[PDB]
């Protein structure tokens, strides 16, 4: 709700 922690913009 605060942040899209599962957002597709993340790298690994």
């Amino acid at each position, epitope marked *: 709700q605060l942040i*899209n922690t599962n*957002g597709s*913009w993340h790298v690994n």
Partner: antibody, heavy 111, light 112 residues
Framework: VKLQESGGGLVQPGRSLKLSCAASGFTFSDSYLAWVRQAPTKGLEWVASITNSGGRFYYRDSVKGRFTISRDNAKSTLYLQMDSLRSEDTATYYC?????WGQGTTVTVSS | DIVLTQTTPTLSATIGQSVSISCRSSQSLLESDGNTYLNWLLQRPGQSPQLLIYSVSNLESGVPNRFSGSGSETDFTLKISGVEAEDLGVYYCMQTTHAPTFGAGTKLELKR
């Protein structure tokens, strides 16, 4: 809930600096965290962010390959390794979980 | 790159006046999970940013009731139902549906 940034200071271009953010008052390993910067007189930019357990992270284009976000869950501390610093990197850096923000640490990159 | 446009860079309000700050997105901010990850922040002079509203309309705890948020998929509004002196500063819209971006800010100044 408390967020306290350190490591900021004055450095010449091309030099390195490591920012740290000491957290307290919450389960650190459960929180997603970010570094948000503000250039003097300007607005906010998302620098880098990291999931609760690491594994997934994000760097804005302008800091890719130069900056390294990391966290120590056992020490409740968030880090931002900043290498090859440019004048463009001059800003106050905030450590944040969105609902809570630190007081900031100022970084000045100048010759 | 998602562009968050806050059309009004400055707003002049009187105490007790109702104000609305708009934020327009370049693309839809509706995420695949059904949530719209648009937040509202206030930054008072010399202070760090402070969260007012998260996910379009949710008021953060400790934040006065006079602040409300609404929005579609691309158009968002922060409403201040009766401005107070402590509400003066710069308001920022921000999204995390896509690679995180902020608006350039809207300065809320006092009309005299």
């Amino acid at each position: 809930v408390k967020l306290q940034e350190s490591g900021g200071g004055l450095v010449q271009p091309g030099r390195s600096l490591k920012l740290s953010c000491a957290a307290s008052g919450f389960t650190f390993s459960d929180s997603y965290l970010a570094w948000v910067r503000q250039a003097p007189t300007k607005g906010l930019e998302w620098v880098a962010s990291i999931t609760n357990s690491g594994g997934r992270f994000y760097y804005r284009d302008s800091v890719k390959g130069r900056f390294t976000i990391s966290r120590d869950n056992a020490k409740s501390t968030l880090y931002l390794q900043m290498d090859s610093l440019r004048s463009e990197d001059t800003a106050t850096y905030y450590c944040t979980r969105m609902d809570y923000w630190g007081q900031g640490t100022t970084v000045t990159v100048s010759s | 790159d998602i562009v968050l446009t806050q059309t009004t860079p400055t707003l002049s309000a009187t105490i007790g006046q109702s104000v609305s700050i708009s934020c327009r997105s370049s693309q839809s901010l509706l995420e695949s999970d059904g949530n719209t990850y648009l937040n509202w922040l206030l930054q008072r002079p010399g202070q760090s940013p402070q969260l007012l509203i998260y996910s379009v309309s949710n008021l953060e705890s400790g934040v006065p009731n006079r602040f409300s948020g609404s929005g579609s998929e691309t158009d968002f509004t922060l409403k201040i139902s009766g401005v107070e002196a402590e509400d003066l500063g710069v308001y920022y819209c921000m999204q995390t549906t896509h690679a995180p971006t902020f608006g350039a800010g809207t300065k809320l100044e006092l009309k005299r």
